């Protein structure tokens, strides 16, 4: 394995490109309307929401619950993609299957929030594969609890985006997020922490070639990782609240088992 370090960065990156439909370089041209005369449809109020829903699946309750369910769809799609992505990290499939699951369990949402930043700016975010753009303010204007779910993610994304990472950076970051040695219930820690060490080692080298001026970019990234942990724990608890006191808020089974006893 000391051998596969040399192309480890390149390896992780192209797993990222292979496995994630939407990426930062794609989101960024869309959000900058430079490739196109035809911007995403803007969902900024209840009416424009209803307009977009007309595209249908191509149920049906209150507006928040409708938005809620649609997010789960993207979440499921991303968890799945991350699953494939992790299998591609050298030594991940060689791990105890009960460890392959706890790594994903605790890591998916951290990585999801990290990758979300790519489709976000201070005013909103791309949805439906970049065809839509739902505003931050609209989401905030939602009611009681639902208006509280996305906002902290915007807050994180704005600071994370100021680091100006590219996908080759982000892929490694996500890889490191995933191979975390201190997750609960991990069987053979040592092997994993060894995995961690190698990824962090190529990450740091990569940051130094890629962002030579940003001397402490790597420590900055370490703190982002801590921040993401806190973010995910908080999100986990909000989603539980909503799971308790919201009848129509059904949770897709794959996500049911992820939150199920996390934080």
């Amino acid at each position: 394995e000391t051998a596969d370090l040399k192309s480890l960065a390149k390896r992780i990156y192209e797993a990222y490109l292979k496995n994630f439909n939407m990426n930062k370089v794609k989101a960024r041209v869309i959000l900058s309307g430079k490739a196109s005369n035809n911007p995403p449809f803007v969902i900024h109020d209840m009416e424009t929401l209803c307009m977009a829903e007309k595209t249908l699946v191509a149920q049906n309750k209150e507006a928040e619950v409708r938005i809620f369910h649609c997010c789960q769809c993207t979440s499921v799609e991303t968890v799945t993609e991350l699953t494939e992505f992790a299998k591609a990290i050298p030594g991940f499939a060689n791990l105890d299957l009960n460890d392959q699951v706890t790594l994903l369990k605790y890591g998916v949402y951290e990585a999801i929030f990290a990758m979300l930043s790519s489709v976000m700016n201070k005013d909103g975010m791309l949805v439906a594969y970049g065809n839509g753009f739902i505003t931050r303010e609209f989401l905030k204007s939602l009611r009681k609890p639902f208006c509280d779910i996305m906002e902290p993610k915007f807050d994180f994304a704005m600071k994370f985006n100021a680091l100006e990472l590219d996908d080759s950076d982000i892929s490694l970051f996500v890889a490191a997020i995933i191979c975390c040695g201190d997750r609960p219930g991990l069987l053979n820690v040592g092997h994993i922490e060894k995995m961690q060490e190698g990824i962090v080692h190529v990450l740091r080298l990569h940051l130094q070639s890629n962002h030579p001026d940003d001397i402490f970019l790597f420590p900055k990234l370490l703190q982002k990782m801590a921040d993401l942990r806190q973010l995910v724990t908080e999100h986990a608890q909000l989603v539980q609240i909503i799971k308790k006191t919201e009848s129509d808020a059904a949770l897709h089974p794959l996500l049911q088992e992820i939150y199920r006893d996390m934080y």
Binding site: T83, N98, V101, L104, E257
Partner: peptide
């Protein structure tokens, strides 16, 4: 156990 309390996930893990 985990492999049990994480059915779908587990199934994804294996090919």
């Amino acid at each position: 156990s985990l492999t049990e309390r994480h059915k779908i996930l587990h199934r994804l893990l294996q090919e």
